[PDB]
Amino acid sequence: DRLTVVKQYVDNVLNKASDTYHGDKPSPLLADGVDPRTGQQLEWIFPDGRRAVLSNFSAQQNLMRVMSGLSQLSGDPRYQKRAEDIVRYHFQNYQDPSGLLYWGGHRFVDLKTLQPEGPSEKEMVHELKNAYPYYDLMFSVDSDATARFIRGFWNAHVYDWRILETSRHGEYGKPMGALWESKFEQQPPFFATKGLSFLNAGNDLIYSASLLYKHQQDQGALTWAKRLADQYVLPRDAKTGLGVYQFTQALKREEPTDDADTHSKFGDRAQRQFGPEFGPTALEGNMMLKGRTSTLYSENALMQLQLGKDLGPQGQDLLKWTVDGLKAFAKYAYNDQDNTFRPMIANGQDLSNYTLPRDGYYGKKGTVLKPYKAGNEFLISYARAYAIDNDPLLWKVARGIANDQGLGDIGTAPGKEVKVNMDTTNSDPYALFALLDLYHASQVADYRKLAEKIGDNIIKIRYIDGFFMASSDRQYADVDAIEPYALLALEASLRNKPQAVAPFLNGAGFTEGAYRMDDGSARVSTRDNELFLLNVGEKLQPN
Numbered sequence: 001d002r003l004t005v006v007k008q009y010v011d012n013v014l015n016k017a018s019d020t021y022h023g024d025k026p027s028p029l030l031a032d033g034v035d036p037r038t039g040q041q042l043e044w045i046f047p048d049g050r051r052a053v054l055s056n057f058s059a060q061q062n063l064m065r066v067m068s069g070l071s072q073l074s075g076d077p078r079y080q081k082r083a084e085d086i087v088r089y090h091f092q093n094y095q096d097p098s099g100l101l102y103w104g105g106h107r108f109v110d111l112k113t114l115q116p117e118g119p120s121e122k123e124m125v126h127e128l129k130n131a132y133p134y135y136d137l138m139f140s141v142d143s144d145a146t147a148r149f150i151r152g153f154w155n156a157h158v159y160d161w162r163i164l165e166t167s168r169h170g171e172y173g174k175p176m177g178a179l180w181e182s183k184f185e186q187q188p189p190f191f192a193t194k195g196l197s198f199l200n201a202g203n204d205l206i207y208s209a210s211l212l213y214k215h216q217q218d219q220g221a222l223t224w225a226k227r228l229a230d231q232y233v234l235p236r237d238a239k240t241g242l243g244v245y246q247f248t249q250a251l252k253r254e255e256p257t258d259d260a261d262t263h264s265k266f267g268d269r270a271q272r273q274f275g276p277e278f279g280p281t282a283l284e285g286n287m288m289l290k291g292r293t294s295t296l297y298s299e300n301a302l303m304q305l306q307l308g309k310d311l312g313p314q315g316q317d318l319l320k321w322t323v324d325g326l327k328a329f330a331k332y333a334y335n336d337q338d339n340t341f342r343p344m345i346a347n348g349q350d351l352s353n354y355t356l357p358r359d360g361y362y363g364k365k366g367t368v369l370k371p372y373k374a375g376n377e378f379l380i381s382y383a384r385a386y387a388i389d390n391d392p393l394l395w396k397v398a399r400g401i402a403n404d405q406g407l408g409d410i411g412t413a414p415g416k417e418v419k420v421n422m423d424t425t426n427s428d429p430y431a432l433f434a435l436l437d438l439y440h441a442s443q444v445a446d447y448r449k450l451a452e453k454i455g456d457n458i459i460k461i462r463y464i465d466g467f468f469m470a471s472s473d474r475q476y477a478d479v480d481a482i483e484p485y486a487l488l489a490l491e492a493s494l495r496n497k498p499q500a501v502a503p504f505l506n507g508a509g510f511t512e513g514a515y516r517m518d519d520g521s522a523r524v525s526t527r528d529n530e531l532f533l534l535n536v537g538e539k540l541q542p543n
């Protein structure tokens, strides 16, 4: 029984990931990682040898959705109540006067001391990148505190409201400026600014402002959310429709002297490394490379499709922008023959098997940019895009991904010539999610029966020592694992209650800083992502 499995999983989390450092007066906070064998909680090791237990609430927002979903479907209110208690404790103790929380890329809470920590010395700042926190829950706990966060988020990350210069970093303790009442002057594509308008951060701004509109009817918030979304659409290639990862370029204020020094103050990093051979269109925003294309055609897509639907008539532009970009990506970059995307520049330039001729931001000289497999996260965005626009081009990509992933043939069109593989070994939560989307739009039973198979596979192979892990050899389980989320989405569909589980937008959290190695030296730019990829007996590799 899949609901029984998720219930026991969340019970394990609330046992093994809980505050064990304050006696019989624990906080409601949770450790991000637990070794499921021993119950050892994942720790950050600071330069001077001090150990903190990593509690980063930005990295627990899938769990929060899982806890809410489990309460809804099972009728047991303890998981909802605990998630509310965690939210409340963060507004109570870990929200600064500006509204910002001690979470995100560079701040977390030590579960042992309950103090906010900052692992990155130079960057004691607020940062969210494809995080998509569960704002619906936060609003239900404390709407004023949530609203204060979202406004303080925009206040810190918009450097210049006139031109919408944005940054992935935001300073704590800033006073409130003109915010939504700021005057706007639309600038031409790729104007030069200090702030780097990466779409991973841009995603979080758009999403948060839209949720402030959703809950408080804040028209200022919706105006700016849509305006920011449009910033990423206006510089799209007029011929290809591809792009963009950012809508500004780094302002050059020093002349570069070394290729491997890729600080943004030397100017656009793609123009440095690609400009001599490719010309003016080699710009960061135009580099349709692996990772960037997930942020653009997965994370951004999932959020904007759901937002576009929510807004009814005024969401029609959003839906169009979103589906058009997915079409362009499928048209130019997708290789039907082997289920790959081509590394590309947004001008339509194919970069497949290109050898980098000098060092730079995108790799060392001699690095070869290769086609990369279209992952199951893309199956979701193409399945969802097709649901609103039944284009065979969108169906082609979904069909190609599924086939490559051991799922069989989903058909020539939904319900036509379907030969899915009911004996699949696929245990990918992303694939489960996308099959549930395919099922919802078409009501073709085979898609949901395939989703049931993936769920059983998840339970059989990824449910280990009461946790969910992508491999049986992994040292630590992540309490934010999406395996239980996909299992609950399936339960909700079968029970005819899809609204019992929050819509899945493929958000996730991360922590980054200096991490003290076992030889006493500092490993700069260490991510908790790297810690969750370690197997038993493996140590972090010098970077």
Ligand SMILES: O=C(O)[C@H]1O[C@@H](O[C@@H]2[C@H](O)[C@@H](O)[C@@H](O[C@@H]3[C@H](O)[C@@H](O)[C@@H](O)O[C@@H]3C(=O)O)O[C@@H]2C(=O)O)[C@H](O)[C@@H](O)[C@H]1O
Binding pocket: 129, 168, 198, 200, 262, 263, 264, 290, 291, 292
């Ligand atoms: O594809 C990858 O390798 C990753 O993209 C990640 O973000 C990139 C970059 O790799 C990070 O180092 C980070 O870079 C910024 C600045 O560009 C850099 O000069 C320096 O100042 O560090 C910065 C930082 O924020 O740490 O961010 C960019 C980005 O596009 O966000 C991405 O976060 C990661 O998950 C990989 O997919």
